[PDB]
Each structure stands twice: as structure tokens, then as C-alpha cells.
From Swiss-Prot, chains A, B:
Oligomeric and partner information: Homodimer or heterodimer.
Protein name: Glutathione S-transferase Mu 2
Residues annotated to bind substrate: 115
Phosphoserine modification, residue list: 26, 43, 116
A molecular function GO annotation: glutathione binding
Pfam families: GST_C (PF00043), GST_N (PF02798)
An annotated GO cellular component: mitochondrion
Biological-process GO terms, alphabetical: cellular detoxification of nitrogen compound; cellular response to caffeine; glutathione metabolic process; hepoxilin biosynthetic process; linoleic acid metabolic process; nitrobenzene metabolic process; regulation of release of sequestered calcium ion into cytosol by sarcoplasmic reticulum; response to catechin
Species, as recorded: Rattus norvegicus (Rat)
Its biological purpose: Conjugation of reduced glutathione to a wide number of exogenous and endogenous hydrophobic electrophiles. Participates in the formation of novel hepoxilin regioisomers.
Record-annotated GST N-terminal domain positions: 1-87
Name of the gene encoding the protein in the UniProt record: Gstm2
PROSITE patterns reported in the protein's UniProt record: GST_CTER, GST_NTER
UniProt miscellaneous comment: Yb subclass selectively binds steroid hormones.
Residue sites binding glutathione per the record: 6-7, 42-45, 49, 58-59, 71-72
């Protein structure tokens, strides 16, 4: 089987866990523990960080027989290629490439706020700008069923994660954007995904590592 | 022609400027000014940020007739696809995807240090870890002429930029890694690139925006 390795948190690996599920991939997971305070021991991972044969050791990592892959987006495109979940025309490739990169920037901005010691101050300011972020995703989707167009691709997995994390943070955030509420529902309605969400393999939370100031531990 | 828009700094756009050059693309550049202190006025860009028809307005942006693209990596893959500068086998696609994402993480870590108010403190600590980063790039390249293998691809443009920025920061950093010194030289020896470096279109510096604590203004 493929081996997926990552911390015992949702972090930036939810889309990969979801895609492995969707595609019916045979896999095993290693979920590394993180020390509690104050030294947040990472010994468990650091012991093996250089013993796995990865080119640029990192978490997450995917091991597929001879292929050893790091960088979340790279793991996403490898599974995409194997299962034909890429854009098939130039317009679709474009949309996929922009959104891939935009889904990372949206996740990183949320992580910045949640990890800052002055969270209680940043939260309000993050929320102020939330209607603009959501609007741009909503206008992008339009009346299409999925982000690339008529076909589900791997980017729908990463945008689902951005949306989900934001609705956990601020439950009301999708109410003024119905195509986005609808997308969430439709993604959560795919059989393999609803089965997974009800299984003991599921890990929705915590999102962030234990030092976060909002949902880490 | 295509329109490339970005701040009047090197920032994360050097690879795009280089690739436009390499490929002999017909283009025009808009380079936006940034206010000097303390308010670092961005009015010049913000005036047009929403008037260009971009889906997720950002800098850099590329306009190619009907296509309007944001996110640096997305702009890189669009030019790559048009000019056949992608990996052609699965092993090559993999390498390209990992390095694309790893070149971003290396650039972001350098930017974090250069932008921190406590730079003079971070510099030493960044340097301590530099031999490990360089080693991993060097072992990755091996005896190949380019990063993907035998073919130049767009990732060579982004890794060239990482390497160049680091040798500006710490001139001695490539001396213990000759395949990396050699790659730099070979990239800088391509005709279109050496012509560009000597033209009035060239912008090597400043790297960072004016609020940086090391090379911004
Ligand atoms: N891709 C389908 C496959 C579904 C799937 O991969 N189940 C695994 C067992 S599940 C996994 C695991 C994943 C997450 C959390 C825990 C576990 C786990 C727990 C106890 C014992 C073994 C495990 C394992 O580490 C399995 O063994 N499948 C057949 C095989 O690999 O030949 C789906 O994604 O829905
Ligand atoms: N661009 C890469 C980035 C790879 C990378 O940074 N990995 C972090 C873990 S990922 C990150 C994160 C990002 C967003 C949301 C949460 C997390 C997170 C969660 C739990 C614990 C640590 C984190 C972190 O804050 C890691 O711990 N690396 C092992 C190492 O450094 O030895 C990728 O897309 O794959
Ligand atoms: N891709 C080849 C093409 C080379 C190329 O694109 N030169 C542009 C003029 S150059 C550009 C510019 C680029 C950077 C900085 C300044 C300028 C600039 C300055 C004054 C007046 C016009 C300009 C313009 O904004 C040109 O007009 N070429 C023919 C055309 O577009 O049909 C190369 O990359 O080496
Ligand atoms: N993931 C995206 C990221 C797009 C993005 O963040 N763009 C910044 C400029 S880029 C950044 C930077 C990153 C690394 C090195 C330097 C810079 C930089 C230089 C000058 C001035 C501002 C900067 C910044 O610190 C910008 O100003 N956006 C317009 C806006 O926000 O309205 C991409 O890869 O394309």
C-alpha cells in the first residue's frame, strides 16, 4: 500500500486523506505525535526524518512503492494524474493552477491568525475581510457544479478544505453565498466521502498544532 | 502582447521575467510604485486592482489576450505549457511538482528573515541551517544538467532564482556545492538570458519591498 505520513492533526493534509478515500486507494497512515508544552517534542518524526529516503524530508510525505513524494500539492497532483482528476482543456488547467495556489494562500492566511499570540486582536480583522474572500470564490464557481467546470478535479478537494475550515472558524460565513453552501453539500454527498466521514479513519480536528491559539490541541 | 504586472522589485517575479525572455515572448511590463514611509502607499495598484477583470486580483498578474492569470506558479505553468517546458515522463513531472513547491518554501523562508524587525538576530540562525538546504538541492540535481533531468523545464527558472537570491545574501554559499555553482553558470550562459541580463529591461534588485530590513528599497 501507499504510506501517508503526517502529524496527528488535520493541518494541510485533509485534502490528501479525502482524495485517497475518493479514489479507493489502498493506504496506511502514520500519524506522528507532538510533544505537549513547552518543548513540543518532535522526536518521533525527527528520529526518522532522514531515514526514509525522501529528497526534501517534510510532512506530509507519500510513499508509493519506489516513489517518495513530499510537498502537499505535489502529492495531490501525483494522485490526480494516477486517477485522471486533472483539467483536460487549457481553460480547465488554468483554473486548476490558479485555484491550487489560491487555496494555499487562503489556508496560510488563516493559519497565520490562528497561530499568532495576539489572536483575540487579529480575529476581528480577519473576519472584516472574509466577505471579500468568500465572494471571489463564489463568483469563481458561478453556476458550475465543480471549480474546474463540469468535471470534479483535485482542486475541489483543496477548496472544500478551505471552505470547511472557515465554516468551523465562523459558522455563518457561507450563508450569503449559496453556490458555496451547495458545493460543500455536494462534496460531502459523494458516497466515498460520506462513508469516510462516518468511519474510524476520519480526523476532522484539531486543525492546527498544539501551540496554536485557536484549535490546535 | 502579454502584459505582466508587478511591483518595481524583483520579489517573486524574476522567474517569470526570465521565462518571458527565454521563450522570446512579446510582452510589456507594468511596474507599480510603492509609497515610501511610513504609509507605503499602494494607491497606484489598488486603484486598478478590481478594474482588470482578474478572478482573484493579485500581483503578479499576466494578461494574455482573453486569459487573465494570477498566482506566480500558475503564470509559470501557463508559459511552460505554451512553450513545451514541462516534464514529459512521470518521473519528470514528479520532480517538477516537488521542486516547484519546495522553491516556494525556500523563498518564503528567506523573505520571513529579511522582513523581520529582528533580522540582525535571525540572520545568524538562518545561516546556520543554510548548508542543509543547499545540500538537499545539490543531492537532488546530482550529475544532471537541469533539475528535471536532461531537459530544461520551468522549474530551473524558479530554482535559479532561489540560488541567486541566496548567493546575493551570502556570497559564499555555493562554494561547497559545485554542481550548484555550475548550474547557475550554465543557466546564466543561455543566450537569451545573457542578452537579458545586459539589457535595460533587467531588474535584479531590490529583492524585497521597501519595508524589508535587508534589501527592499
Ligand atoms: N482508499 C480506500 C481504502 C481504505 C483503507 O485504506 N483502509 C485500509 C485500512 S485503514 C488504514 C488507516 C487509515 C486511517 C486511520 C487508521 C487506519 C488504520 C487503523 C487500523 C489498522 C489499519 C489502518 C490502516 O493504516 C486498508 O487496509 N485497505 C485495503 C488495502 O490497503 O489493501 C478508502 O480510502 O476508503
Ligand atoms: N509547503 C509544504 C509545507 C510543509 C510543512 O510546513 N510541514 C510542516 C507541517 S504543516 C504546517 C501547517 C500548515 C497549515 C495548517 C496547519 C499546519 C500544521 C499542523 C500541525 C503541525 C504543524 C503544522 C505546520 O505549521 C512540518 O512540520 N514539516 C516537517 C519538518 O519541518 O521537519 C507542504 O505543502 O507540504
Ligand atoms: N520576449 C522577447 C521580447 C523582448 C521585449 O518584450 N521587448 C518588447 C519591448 S520591452 C518591454 C519592457 C520590458 C521590461 C522593461 C521595460 C520595457 C519597455 C521599456 C520601454 C518601452 C517598452 C517596453 C516594453 O514594455 C517588445 O516590444 N517586443 C516586441 C513585441 O512585443 O512585439 C524577450 O523577452 O527577450
Ligand atoms: N501566492 C502568491 C503571493 C502573491 C503575493 O503575495 N503578492 C504580493 C506581492 S509578492 C510578496 C513577496 C514575496 C516574496 C518576495 C518578495 C515579495 C514582495 C516584494 C515586493 C512587495 C511585496 C512583496 C510581497 O511580500 C502583493 O502585493 N499582492 C497584491 C495584493 O495583495 O493586492 C503568488 O505566488 O503569486
Amino acid at each position: 500500500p501507499m504510506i501517508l505520513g503526517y502529524w496527528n492533526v488535520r493541518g494541510l493534509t485533509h485534502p490528501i486523506r479525502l482524495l485517497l478515500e475518493y479514489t479507493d486507494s489502498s493506504y496506511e497512515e502514520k500519524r506522528y505525535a507532538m510533544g505537549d508544552a513547552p518543548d513540543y517534542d518532535r522526536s518521533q518524526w525527527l528520529n526518522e526524518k532522514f531515514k526514509l529516503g525522501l529528497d526534501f524530508p517534510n510532512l506530509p510525505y507519500l510513499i508509493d512503492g519506489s516513489r517518495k513524494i513530499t510537498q502537499s500539492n505535489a502529492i495531490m497532483r501525483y494522485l490526480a494524474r494516477k486517477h485522471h482528476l486533472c483539467g483536460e482543456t487549457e481553460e480547465e488547467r488554468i483554473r486548476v493552477d490558479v485555484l491550487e495556489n489560491q487555496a494555499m494562500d487562503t489556508r496560510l492566511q488563516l493559519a497565520m491568525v490562528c497561530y499568532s499570540p495576539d489572536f483575540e486582536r487579529k480575529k476581528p480583522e480577519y473576519l472584516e475581510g472574509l466577505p471579500e474572500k468568500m465572494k471571489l470564490y463564489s463568483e469563481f464557481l458561478g453556476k458550475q457544479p465543480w471549480f474546474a467546470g463540469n468535471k470534479i478535479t483535485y482542486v475541489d478537494f483543496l477548496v472544500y478544505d478551505v471552505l470547511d475550515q472557515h465554516r468551523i472558524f465562523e459558522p455563518k460565513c457561507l450563508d450569503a453565498f449559496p453556490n458555496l453552501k451547495d458545493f460543500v453539500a455536494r462534496f460531502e454527498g459523494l458516497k466515498k466521502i460520506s462513508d469516510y466521514m462516518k468511519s474510524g479513519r476520519f480526523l476532522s480536528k484539531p486543525i492546527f498544532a498544539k501551540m496554536a491559539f485557536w484549535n490546535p490541541k
